[PDB]
TrEMBL record:
Domain of life: Eukaryota
GO annotation terms (biological process): nitrate assimilation
Gene3D superfamilies named among the record's database cross-references: 3.90.480.20, Sulfite Reductase Hemoprotein, domain 1 (3.30.413.10)
Annotated ranges, domain Nitrite/sulphite reductase 4Fe-4S: 158-316, 420-527
Species annotation: Nicotiana tabacum
Family of the protein in this entry: Belongs to the nitrite and sulfite reductase 4Fe-4S domain family.
Positions contributing to siroheme binding: 81, 124-126, 128, 130, 132, 206-207, 209, 248, 289, 292, 385, 424, 429, 468, 470
Keyword annotations: 4Fe-4S, Heme, Iron, Iron-sulfur, Metal-binding, Nitrate assimilation, Oxidoreductase
Annotated protein name in UniProt: Ferredoxin--nitrite reductase, chloroplastic
Needed co-factor(s): [4Fe-4S] cluster; siroheme
Pathway the protein contributes to: Nitrogen metabolism; nitrate reduction (assimilation)
A Gene Ontology molecular function term of the record: metal ion binding
Residues holding [4Fe-4S] cluster: 423, 429, 464, 468
Amino acid sequence: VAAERLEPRVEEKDGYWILKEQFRKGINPQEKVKIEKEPMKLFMENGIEELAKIPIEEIDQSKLTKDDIDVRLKWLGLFHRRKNQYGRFMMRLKLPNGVTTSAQTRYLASVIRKYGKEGCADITTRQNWQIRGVVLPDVPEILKGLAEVGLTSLQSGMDNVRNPVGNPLAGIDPEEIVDTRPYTNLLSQFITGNSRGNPAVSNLPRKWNPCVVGSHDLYEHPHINDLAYMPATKDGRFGFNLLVGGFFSAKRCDEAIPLDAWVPADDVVPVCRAILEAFRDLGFRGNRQKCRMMWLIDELGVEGFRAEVEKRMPQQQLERASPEDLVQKQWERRDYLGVHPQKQEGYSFIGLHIPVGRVQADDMDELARLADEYGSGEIRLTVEQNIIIPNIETSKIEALLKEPVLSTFSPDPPILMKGLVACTGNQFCGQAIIETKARSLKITEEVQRQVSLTKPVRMHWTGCPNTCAQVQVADIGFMGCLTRDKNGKTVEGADVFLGGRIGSDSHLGEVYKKAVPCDDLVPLVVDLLVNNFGAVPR
Ligand code: SRM
Ligand code: SF4
Ligand SMILES: O=N[O-]
Ligand SMILES: [Cl-]
Ligand SMILES: [Cl-]
Ligand SMILES: [K+]
């Protein structure tokens, strides 16, 4: 690698970071959008106020403003559903560690309630909230309303640092390694500039996913994050070994690799900053399929990339990885659904199944009511698109289990539902090839009617090769495709994946059988469960 390759390609100009004039050749169209107008100005210079007043039909008549609503608004967490729900915006938060309050939940419910049939909300595979139905004229008021209740939607889409994932049992599990909340909180504060915007990390070549591990279970999926903090003691000091570059895409899925770096616990933010600066400064900005950070690591080599991180650390210090980390390889991932005692004597948490992560406003209000009546007004989201209500006095559990809403959001649903994960799909997502959420529920219900089993089989449904629902981690994964029935008619189908493992002994699954019509999946899956996962026909 020539020394010229290491020249930073972006520069700070008037509070924002822009590609240098000599590093603009051959850039992709998204890079051109970012140069044409700085997306962060919509928030930081209140550009949204005037934009929101322009009728959408008028907005669509010019490239600049159409790009504002279709692309730049993703820096404010707003996602125009142009193809499948025209004129409506999905809105996505920052929610470090998946932690929400009842007041925040009620606020979000109040926003979606306004939109009637166009509104609903979803828990995401980064333990985050998305709300739906938003119209552009309401955006300024919603941004103000979010801030009022202590929420931000900043930098949650496009070429930004995505939701910092942590241990859903942080602070409450007797078996936790380290409470991840302080760290994910710090990361989110750093990323968003304390909810004011942080332009230093908002012009990346591509999206970038961070997580902080605090569980032996590895609930945080460190193997598939761009930066994963693995708790590790080194030379008598608590800190983190760092894994880098994990990612999924249509073209390529790769597990994170060791940076060969350990940082003291207090250096979590400094090293996040150093890694992001190196990625921002040096990353490829051509073909979008080759812009994730792993591609830079491969170009420089991991040692070459490490040197770039090291030079950007305070005092240019970056220790080598600790020989061992604190995560115990002797471990079985634990079910968190149901009632579990906390480390605080006399308290329990309850994990509740949210079918395919989908809720309506009334459901949100009810969950918020439960968290207030039974817990501490806290609702935690999980990456399987479920919830945990922590901090419940154990003597209240008997009454809680009788609450009518628990018949819908159950502490003990059938085992296949416990592990079911599904992306948005074509109800709202323009890239989706198939409908996912309704279909996956229907198929799973039919499968479980036919077989019983005791193994916690994890089934993931994703609507297109972007694999937002992570089919490569599943015991059985389903990737949307179009295929053909016996008469040659177009039908929805799935490419079926097998081989995904999570926890310490992680492994990426691969296509097992292509082009299976969705209407033919039940017998295939029933047989796979009996033959490979110990299921028994009813
Ligand atoms: C909501 C969510 C799936 C869900 O049902 O839970 C989701 C939904 C979408 N993803 Fe994703 N992704 C979601 C997690 C993921 C993950 C999983 C993860 O983070 O562990 C991945 C795979 C892992 C990874 O990225 O390394 C993922 C890979 C993508 C990709 C492919 C990235 C790539 O490098 O090629 C895109 C397309 C892109 O960014 O170019 C995409 C694009 C999109 C968009 C924003 C596309 C769009 O504008 O329509 C989807 C919005 C649909 C909608 O209305 O909801 N989404 N997306 C997840 C939101 C997470 C969050 O709260 O921030
Ligand atoms: S996997 Fe495809 S269909 Fe599903 S939410 Fe992601 S982009 Fe949309
Ligand atoms: O928002 N899915 O990258
Ligand atoms: Cl995006
Ligand atoms: Cl679209
Ligand atoms: K779920």
